[PDB]
């Protein structure tokens, strides 16, 4: 039907990713549930980067998935996704975690006609979308990212799983342009700065407080570069710095052919320069890799209301917690500062504090879950006492009491 491309043409198309859950080891193991399906507001993590797009004014977007997860996603896409957009799904057989984000986008080179956006399944944002596009719509840059202050964890020092380690970003405040961006481990000797850079934009501010949210917006032409340049594994890792070294250091003169060929957004007047900027604010905006899933979820206090279709017997208590559908709490058991997914069951004498419960989980009688996180289908025996522990998928633990550890199936 004449709905989406009749009167007005399109401006951009959106792509989102699903990268195996790499760093989220105790939760991304089994193929029963993938990264993009882990709940957050008792709602799967994919819901948020999409809600943005839909609210941003997007009738349909594109998702990149891995064959091991093309099944359940659609199943959730066909039933569960609260939104209204349409999602072309693509899971090319070429995928293999040795081929990171950019390589995946590389395979879907053909389905990109206009300028485009690149979110991830974990691009949890509350940032108002107009502030992003209008910026890109105004400056007409060759690229545009986003960054936010690193997430302040209410908990402090449990384990030094540095998530994304640290990212040092150097920008020029007025022009918004981005001039430095590289992770720590790549340069640990002496942090080089080609002074030849400074003699333009001699004012380079740079923060260590900032983290990425994996929001990017590019003019179309770059997609050809991804095709021609096979040595681009991840967008963050390879692409962005590859662009920033071209913003100066003109000896980096692999031909800028891709600019000239008919890609004019029609009179040839933009080839003068290539550029990219950044943008920040102080709102709900960051990127979960394990450690944040506890916090990014905790950031869903905005849900300041009620529970539905559940059964909590008298002599029980639940307050300000977030609990999804169908689950059950038996007599004499308490929940506080904790969230619980779908259709889980929790016996008697149980106590769950500051803990995160996935979907379809059974909790035997009289246990304690002090600030733990448990995957879907898992199972826990009675009289068990876990603090600061994780629980793998579909796993059963019996009567044990251990802290700090990450209990999981024997898996051999």
């Amino acid at each position: 039907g004449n709905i989406q491309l009749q009167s007005i043409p399109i401006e951009f198309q959106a792509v989102v990713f699903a990268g195996f859950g790499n760093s989220l080891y105790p939760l991304t193991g089994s193929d029963a549930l993938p990264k993009a399906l882990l709940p957050i507001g008792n709602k799967p993590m994919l819901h948020y980067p999409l809600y943005w797009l839909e609210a941003a004014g997007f009738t349909s977007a594109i998702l990149i998935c891995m064959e091991e997860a093309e099944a359940h996603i659609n199943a959730w896409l066909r039933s569960g996704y609260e939104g209204h957009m349409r999602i072309h799904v693509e899971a090319p057989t070429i995928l293999d975690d040795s081929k990171s984000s950019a390589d995946a986008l590389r395979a879907v080179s053909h389905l990109i006609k206009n300028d485009f956006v690149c979110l991830s399944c974990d691009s949890i944002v509350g940032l108002p979308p107009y502030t992003v596009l209008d910026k890109f719509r105004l400056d007409n840059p060759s690229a545009l990212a986003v960054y936010s202050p690193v997430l302040k964890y209410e908990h402090i020092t449990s384990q030094s799983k540095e998530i994304d380690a640290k990212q040092l970003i150097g920008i020029e405040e007025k022009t918004s342009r981005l001039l430095y961006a590289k992770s720590s481990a790549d340069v640990g000797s002496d942090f080089t700065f080609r002074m030849s850079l400074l003699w333009k934009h001699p004012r380079v501010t740079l923060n260590t407080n900032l983290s990425d949210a994996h929001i990017f917006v590019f003019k179309h032409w770059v997609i050809d570069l991804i095709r021609e340049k096979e040595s681009i594994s991840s967008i963050r890792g390879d692409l962005i710095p590859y662009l920033v070294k071209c913003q100066y250091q003109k000896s980096f003169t692999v031909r800028e052919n891709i600019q000239r060929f008919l890609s004019s957004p029609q009179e040839i007047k933009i080839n003068a320069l290539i550029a990219k900027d950044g943008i920040i604010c102080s709102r709900a905006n960051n990127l979960p890799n394990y450690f944040e899933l506890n916090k990014c979820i905790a950031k869903l206090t905005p849900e300041q209301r009620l529970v539905d279709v559940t059964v909590s017997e008298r002599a029980l208590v639940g307050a300000d917690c977030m609990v999804n559908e169908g689950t059950t709490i038996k007599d004499n058991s308490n929940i506080k500062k904790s969230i619980i997914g779908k259709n889980c069951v929790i016996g008697k004498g149980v106590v769950v504090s500051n803990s995160i419960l996935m979907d379809n989980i059974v909790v035997e009688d009289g246990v304690r879950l002090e600030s733990c996180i448990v995957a879907s289908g898992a199972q826990i025996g009675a009289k068990s006492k876990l603090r600061e522990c994780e629980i793998g998928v579909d796993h059963r633990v019996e009567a044990g009491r251990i802290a700090r550890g990450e209990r999981l199936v024997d898996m051999e």
Partner: protein, 428 residues
């Protein structure tokens, strides 16, 4: 209460101005018909200084003579000035290590490694300095610099440097020069764990004006190897060689602050003060009871000045008193001392003339520096980059090539007395 001290470091940058420093010290040569140190002096007075000491290494008598007879010796002087002599070619630190050896630093104080033209009220910088001091006594030195263009015509290789400051607390955490063989900028990332928001700046001008605390001279005695402040000292601090202590940078965003040091700086700064950038430090304010007056297009004249009718005066040019100018002669973008005499039908462009200088008819001159009381005959001609000394008269129908400095005494340069100079000699 608190005695505000300050020390000027003359002679320490007597290098480039070799051909004329032998005539008289550089602290005493006239910038715009006004000696250098006066520009530095009123700056000092503008800082509210109450006590000043000056190191000397050349013509100390000739230096002290002016000082004793200067207006800064009178009771109206806001500060008592005393002079100190030492070895020649005074490398810094040796001054400081000699300084505390005399024990005369009451509290915080300032430092100037030469002669400075500026007009910035430092009174703010002190309370900006004494504050963060009174909580962290390891606050050693406050550096003041001028925000400008990276390619600014006043940013020279000596000042062409790169600072890295904490955007919150304005603390310099890394510094390096800009020598022609320094491609990369490197620094150890131990700072990031101790600093959130940083700013890399190349748009600065190392005015080399430094607010120094009380420990500084004694620290130099504890660290005798330090000879250059901007190379040995600060680097030692940032490298934690000199440990547990930190400095601070104050970036000026208005008014003017530059240091006369190179021939590449004199001409520039001279064109600055003429462009009013150091108001009120301008000829028409007439600090030393001169008789100057402003005229449009930055033309400056004094009383009792002889101008012909056919003589034509372009822009950006000043003229000292008692000075005559021949007929049909053209002066443009040059400064001229007092009591000078200009021949007829001559062209003077972007030159620099001093006291009672004589020039004959038909002479073409550009980008030249003429010392005190030097005569040039008619039909002569100079060109861009030349330098003469006192009395180095030139005979009629003569030509001088570029960058060919002269002198009146044989020591290391060329040229002698009378007519034959480049072609032919007058003594060698």
């Amino acid at each position: 209460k608190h005695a505000l001290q300050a020390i000027v470091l003359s002679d320490s940058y007597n290098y480039r101005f070799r051909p004329l420093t032998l005539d008289k010290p550089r602290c005493l040569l006239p910038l715009a018909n006004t000696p250098l140190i006066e520009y530095t002096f009123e700056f000092l007075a503008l800082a509210g200084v109450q006590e000043v000491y000056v190191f000397c290494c050349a013509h100390a008598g000739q230096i002290r003579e002016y000082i004793e007879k200067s207006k800064w010796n009178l009771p109206s002087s806001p500060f008592s000035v005393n002079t100190i002599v030492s070895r020649e070619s005074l490398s810094v630190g040796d001054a400081l290590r000699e300084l505390d050896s005399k024990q005369l630093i009451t509290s915080d104080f300032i430092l100037v490694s030469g002669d400075v033209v500026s007009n910035v009220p430092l009174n703010e910088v002190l309370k900006e300095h004494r504050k963060r001091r009174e909580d962290d006594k390891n606050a050693i030195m406050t550096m003041v610099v001028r925000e400008a263009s990276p390619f600014h015509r006043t940013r020279a290789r000596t000042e062409s440097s790169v600072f890295v400051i904490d955007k919150k607390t304005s603390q310099c955490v890394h510094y390096q020069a800009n020598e022609r063989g320094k491609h990369y900028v490197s620094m150890d990332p131990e700072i990031f764990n101790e600093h959130e928001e940083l700013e890399v700046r190349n748009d600065l001008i190392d005015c080399q004006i430094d607010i120094c605390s009380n420990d500084v001279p004694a620290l130099f005695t504890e660290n005798f190897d330090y000879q250059d402040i901007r190379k040995d000292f600060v680097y030692g601090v940032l490298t934690s060689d000199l440990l547990g202590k930190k400095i601070h940078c104050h970036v000026a965003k208005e008014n003017y602050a530059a240091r006369v040091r190179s021939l590449q700086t004199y001409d520039a700064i001279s064109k600055d003060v003429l462009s009013r950038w150091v108001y009120p430090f301008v000829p028409d304010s007439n600090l030393l009871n001169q008789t100057f007056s402003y005229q449009r297009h930055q033309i400056y004249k004094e009383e009792d000045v002889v101008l012909a009718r056919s003589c034509i005066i372009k822009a950006r040019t000043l003229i000292g008193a008692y000075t005559k100018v021949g007929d049909a002669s053209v002066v443009a973008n040059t400064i001229i001392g007092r009591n000078c005499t200009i021949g007829s039908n001559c062209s003077i462009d972007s030159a620099f003339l001093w006291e009672d200088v004589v020039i004959g008819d038909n002479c073409r001159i550009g980008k030249a520096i003429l010392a005190n009381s030097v005569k040039i005959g008619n039909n002569c001609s100079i060109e861009d980059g030349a330098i003469v000394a006192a009395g180095v008269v030139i005979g009629d129908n003569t030509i001088i090539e570029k960058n060919k400095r002269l002198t009146t005494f044989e020591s290391h340069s060329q040229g002698t007395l009378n007519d034959p100079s480049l072609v032919g000699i007058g003594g060698r």
